[PDB]
Design an enzyme around this catalytic site. Structure first.
Site, short mmCIF file in Angstrom:
data_model
loop_
_atom_site.label_atom_id
_atom_site.label_comp_id
_atom_site.label_asym_id
_atom_site.label_seq_id
_atom_site.Cartn_x
_atom_site.Cartn_y
_atom_site.Cartn_z
N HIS A 219 -37.16 39.78 -16.09
CA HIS A 219 -37.68 39.86 -17.44
C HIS A 219 -38.69 41.01 -17.46
CE1 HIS A 219 -38.49 38.54 -21.55
NE2 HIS A 219 -39.65 39.14 -21.34
N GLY A 220 -38.25 42.13 -18.00
CA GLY A 220 -39.07 43.31 -18.20
C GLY A 220 -39.73 43.23 -19.55
N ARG B 228 -42.66 33.21 -23.99
CA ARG B 228 -42.63 32.36 -25.16
C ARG B 228 -41.50 32.77 -26.04
NH1 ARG B 228 -48.64 33.09 -27.46
NH2 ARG B 228 -48.17 35.19 -26.69
N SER C 252 -33.30 44.92 -17.48
CA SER C 252 -34.65 44.43 -17.80
C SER C 252 -35.67 45.54 -17.81
CB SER C 252 -35.07 43.33 -16.84
OG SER C 252 -34.47 42.10 -17.19
N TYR D 132 -36.54 47.35 -20.91
CA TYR D 132 -37.53 46.69 -21.77
C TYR D 132 -38.99 47.08 -21.46
CZ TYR D 132 -34.09 43.92 -24.24
OH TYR D 132 -33.02 43.55 -25.02
N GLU E 32 -26.57 38.20 -19.49
CA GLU E 32 -27.88 37.80 -19.97
C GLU E 32 -27.94 36.31 -20.03
OE1 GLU E 32 -28.71 38.76 -24.54
OE2 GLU E 32 -27.87 40.47 -23.45
C1 LIG Z 1 -44.89 31.90 -30.39
N1 LIG Z 1 -44.27 33.08 -29.80
C2 LIG Z 1 -44.98 34.02 -29.19
O1 LIG Z 1 -46.20 34.00 -29.10
C3 LIG Z 1 -44.18 35.16 -28.62
C4 LIG Z 1 -44.81 36.14 -27.85
C5 LIG Z 1 -44.05 37.18 -27.34
C6 LIG Z 1 -42.68 37.22 -27.61
N2 LIG Z 1 -41.83 38.25 -27.12
C7 LIG Z 1 -42.38 39.58 -26.82
C8 LIG Z 1 -41.28 40.63 -26.83
N3 LIG Z 1 -40.18 40.27 -25.91
C9 LIG Z 1 -39.13 41.29 -25.97
C10 LIG Z 1 -37.92 41.08 -25.09
C11 LIG Z 1 -36.73 40.54 -25.61
C12 LIG Z 1 -35.60 40.35 -24.83
C13 LIG Z 1 -35.61 40.70 -23.48
N4 LIG Z 1 -34.47 40.50 -22.72
C14 LIG Z 1 -34.49 40.83 -21.47
C15 LIG Z 1 -33.27 40.63 -20.63
C16 LIG Z 1 -35.71 41.42 -20.77
O2 LIG Z 1 -35.74 41.74 -19.57
N5 LIG Z 1 -36.80 41.60 -21.56
C17 LIG Z 1 -36.81 41.26 -22.91
C18 LIG Z 1 -37.91 41.42 -23.74
F1 LIG Z 1 -39.03 41.95 -23.20
C19 LIG Z 1 -39.65 38.94 -26.27
C20 LIG Z 1 -40.75 37.90 -26.20
C21 LIG Z 1 -42.17 36.18 -28.40
F2 LIG Z 1 -40.86 36.17 -28.68
N6 LIG Z 1 -42.87 35.19 -28.89
#
Ligand SMILES: CNC(=O)c1ccc(N2CCN(Cc3ccc4nc(C)c(=O)[nH]c4c3F)CC2)c(F)n1
Length: 350
Positions: free
Chosen positions: A201-202, A217, A243, A246, A327
């Site tokens: 998870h990047g 989250r 990843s 990202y 994924e």
């Molecule tokens: C109550 N909720 C929160 O407070 C909250 C806080 C941060 C949140 N984000 C930040 C952006 N992030 C981007 C992202 C997406 C997909 C990715 N898929 C792979 C394989 C990877 O490797 N990386 C990824 C990836 F970085 C997702 C999660 C979120 F959704 N919610």
């Protein structure tokens, strides 16, 4: 001055960088004068998600550009953008809502980082690195270069970098063993589940203060479920380069951060194309997006009883899929136990 290892100190400085948080907001074309870092709030972000869901409803139901105009402007009212006296670009498509839903997710982590830094106590006698480290409520230790876990981690990076992601190479600078407070107890009902994999998870450097303190989250209920390929869950990859994309590094910032998490996948719901789901079908614990390529399954290794797919990329046998690579998506935050954090130097070939 701090007794913390120098790599841990540099990590804290990196993730609590205010100018990086600002540079990230500028990248999204947010007007920092109309709304600075300190004006960022959950309430506002959630209202912005909710309007994006209304835009999403208008686009899917095929409203005219004159009809949607009103809903597009409502978003720009909640999240001010830098266009001066020019009309902002109209949000009349799914790509536009996806892009804005993604920005909001990132702003949710940035808000946690800035809240942590601006909350708390001020004490001159204490090193700010020590102060900011305690805010994270995470035990961060440096993994020894010659250890078995370090060898396995370096092989995972080395073997799962995809050919289509060859515009850069990856160099592991530091390996951190991470333990978030309370996370291990949260994970307990899933600790002996079948299909437990160590996945990537990047994220951007500006997300990691939020990630270490609150964990990975899922986007909030206000968020449009259609703004994400497999709905609102936590997304992981078995290909390091998938990843590392990202991290959003460049020639002007080639240092990125990537996690290694133990994910309780259980019974996987296998899909080849977008499925904007809210709840998994009965008996399923995760979604697996089936890629054309997969790390060689006969090359899987075990690190603390968890499956490590460090094999080289081979054909999965999967036909007519919308994904080049696998994924994995979990829809319960408890199904994730963060294990490592890697600092990587991206060496661009372009
Ligand atoms: C109550 N909720 C929160 O407070 C909250 C806080 C941060 C949140 N984000 C930040 C952006 N992030 C981007 C992202 C997406 C997909 C990715 N898929 C792979 C394989 C990877 O490797 N990386 C990824 C990836 F970085 C997702 C999660 C979120 F959704 N919610």
């Amino acid at each position: 001055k701090s007794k913390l290892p120098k790599p841990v100190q540099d990590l804290i400085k990196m993730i609590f960088d205010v100018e990086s948080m600002k540079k990230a907001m500028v990248e999204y074309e947010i007007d920092l004068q109309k709304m600075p870092l300190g004006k960022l709030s959950k309430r506002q972000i959630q209202a912005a998600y909710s309007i994006l869901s209304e835009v999403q409803q208008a686009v899917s139901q095929g409203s005219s550009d004159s009809q949607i105009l009103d809903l597009s402007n409502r978003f720009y009212t909640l999240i001010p953008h830098d266009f001066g006296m020019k009309k902002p670009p109209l949000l009349n498509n799914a790509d536009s809502v996806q892009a804005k839903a993604e920005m909001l997710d990132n702003l949710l982590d940035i808000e946690v980082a800035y809240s942590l830094l601006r909350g708390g106590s001020d004490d001159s006698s204490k090193d700010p690195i020590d102060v900011n480290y305690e805010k994270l409520k995470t035990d961060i230790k440096v993994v020894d270069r010659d250890s078995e876990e370090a060898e396995i981690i370096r092989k995972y990076v080395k073997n799962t970098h995809a050919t289509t992601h060859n515009a850069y190479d990856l160099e592991v600078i530091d390996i951190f063993k991470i333990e978030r407070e309370g996370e291990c107890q949260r994970y307990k009902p899933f600790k002996q589940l079948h299909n437990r994999r160590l996945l990537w998870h990047g994220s951007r450097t500006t997300n990691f203060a939020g990630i270490l303190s609150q964990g990975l989250r899922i986007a909030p209920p206000e968020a449009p479920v259609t703004g994400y390929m497999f709905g609102k869950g936590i997304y992981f990859a078995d290909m390091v380069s998938k990843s590392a994309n990202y991290c959003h590094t460049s020639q002007g910032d080639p240092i990125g951060l990537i996690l290694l998490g133990e994910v309780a996948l259980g019974n996987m719901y296998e899909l080849k194309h977008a499925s904007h789901i809210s709840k998994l079908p009965k008996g399923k614990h995760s979604v697996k997006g089936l890629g054309k390529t997969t790390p060689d399954p006969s090359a899987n290794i075990s690190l603390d009883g968890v499956d490590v797919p460090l094999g080289t990329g081979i054909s999965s046998g999967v036909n007519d899929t919308s994904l080049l690579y696998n994924e994995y998506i979990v829809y319960d935050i408890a199904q994730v136990n963060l294990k490592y954090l890697l600092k990587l130097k991206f060496n661009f070939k372009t």
